[PDB]
mmCIF file of C-alpha atoms in Angstrom:
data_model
loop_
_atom_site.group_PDB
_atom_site.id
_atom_site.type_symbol
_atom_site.label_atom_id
_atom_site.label_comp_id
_atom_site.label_asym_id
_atom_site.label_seq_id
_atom_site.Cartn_x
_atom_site.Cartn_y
_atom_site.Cartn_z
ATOM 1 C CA UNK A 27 138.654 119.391 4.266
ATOM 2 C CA UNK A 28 137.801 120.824 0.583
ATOM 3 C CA UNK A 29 138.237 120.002 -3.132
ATOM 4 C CA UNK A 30 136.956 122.186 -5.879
ATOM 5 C CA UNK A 31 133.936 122.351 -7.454
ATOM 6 C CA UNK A 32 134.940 122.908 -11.457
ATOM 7 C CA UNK A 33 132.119 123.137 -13.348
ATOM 8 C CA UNK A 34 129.635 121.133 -11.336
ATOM 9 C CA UNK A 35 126.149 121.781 -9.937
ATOM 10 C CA UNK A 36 124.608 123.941 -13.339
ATOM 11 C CA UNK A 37 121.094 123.012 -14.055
ATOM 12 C CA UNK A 38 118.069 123.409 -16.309
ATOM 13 C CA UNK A 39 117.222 126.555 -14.835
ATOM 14 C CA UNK A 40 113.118 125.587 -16.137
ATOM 15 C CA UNK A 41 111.133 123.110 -17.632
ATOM 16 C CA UNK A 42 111.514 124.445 -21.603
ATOM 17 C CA UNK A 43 112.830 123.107 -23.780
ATOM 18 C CA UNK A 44 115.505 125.124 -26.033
ATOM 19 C CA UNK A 45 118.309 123.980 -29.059
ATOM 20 C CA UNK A 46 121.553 124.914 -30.656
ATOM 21 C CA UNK A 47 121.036 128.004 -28.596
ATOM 22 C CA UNK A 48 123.450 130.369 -26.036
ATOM 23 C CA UNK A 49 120.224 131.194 -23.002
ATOM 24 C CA UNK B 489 102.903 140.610 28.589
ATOM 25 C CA UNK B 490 101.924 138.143 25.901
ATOM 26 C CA UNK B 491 102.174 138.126 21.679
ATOM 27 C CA UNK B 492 99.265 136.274 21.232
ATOM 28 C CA UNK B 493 95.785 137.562 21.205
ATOM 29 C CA UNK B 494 92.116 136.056 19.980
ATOM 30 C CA UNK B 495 89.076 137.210 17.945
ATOM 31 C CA UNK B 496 85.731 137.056 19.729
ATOM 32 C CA UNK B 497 83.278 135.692 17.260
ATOM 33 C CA UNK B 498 79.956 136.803 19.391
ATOM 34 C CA UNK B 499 76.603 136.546 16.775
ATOM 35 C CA UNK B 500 75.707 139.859 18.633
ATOM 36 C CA UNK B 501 78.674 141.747 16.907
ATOM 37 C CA UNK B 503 78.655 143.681 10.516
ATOM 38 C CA UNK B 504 82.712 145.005 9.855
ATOM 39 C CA UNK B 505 83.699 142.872 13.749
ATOM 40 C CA UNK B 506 81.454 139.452 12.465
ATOM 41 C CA UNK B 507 83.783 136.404 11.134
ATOM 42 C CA UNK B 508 84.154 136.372 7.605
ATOM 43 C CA UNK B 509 85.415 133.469 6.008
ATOM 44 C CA UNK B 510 88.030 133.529 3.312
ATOM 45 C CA UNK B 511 89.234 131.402 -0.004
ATOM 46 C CA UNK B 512 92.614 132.410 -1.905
ATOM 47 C CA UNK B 513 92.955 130.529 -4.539
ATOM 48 C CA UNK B 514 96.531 130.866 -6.319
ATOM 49 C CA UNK B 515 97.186 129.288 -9.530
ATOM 50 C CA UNK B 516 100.535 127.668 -10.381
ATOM 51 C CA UNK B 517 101.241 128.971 -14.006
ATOM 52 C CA UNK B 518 104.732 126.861 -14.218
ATOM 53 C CA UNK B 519 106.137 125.245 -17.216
ATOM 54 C CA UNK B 520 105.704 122.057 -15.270
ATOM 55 C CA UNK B 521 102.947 119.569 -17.020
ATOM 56 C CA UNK B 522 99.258 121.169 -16.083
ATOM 57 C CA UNK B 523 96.741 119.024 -13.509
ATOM 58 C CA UNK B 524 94.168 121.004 -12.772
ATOM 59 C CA UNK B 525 92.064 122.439 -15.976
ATOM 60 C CA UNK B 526 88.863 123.762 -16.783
ATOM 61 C CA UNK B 527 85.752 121.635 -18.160
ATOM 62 C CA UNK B 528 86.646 122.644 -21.892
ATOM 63 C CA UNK B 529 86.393 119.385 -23.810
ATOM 64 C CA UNK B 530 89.321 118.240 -25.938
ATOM 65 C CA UNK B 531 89.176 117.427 -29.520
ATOM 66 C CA UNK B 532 90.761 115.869 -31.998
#
């Protein structure tokens, strides 16, 4: 069986920090 | 046949004597830091 996966599963790719900022 | 094979650490062997070895690798990451040098910390 299945279902999809929308947007899930993105994260912080490191530990910085970073605002109001496309990365 | 076999993969395996041994050293054979005799004292009576300088380039064929055991050397140890220490590799020290430092984790740079942007992770919090644990282990640091004796510098002293100020104010």
């Amino acid at each position: 069986a299945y279902t999809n996966s929308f947007t899930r599963g993105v994260y912080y790719p490191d530990k910085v920090f970073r605002s109001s900022v496309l990365h | 046949y076999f993969p395996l094979q041994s050293y054979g650490f005799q004292p009576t062997n300088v380039g064929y004597q055991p050397y140890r070895v220490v590799v020290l690798s430092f984790e740079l990451l942007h992770a919090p830091a644990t282990v640091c040098g004796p510098k002293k910390s100020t104010n």
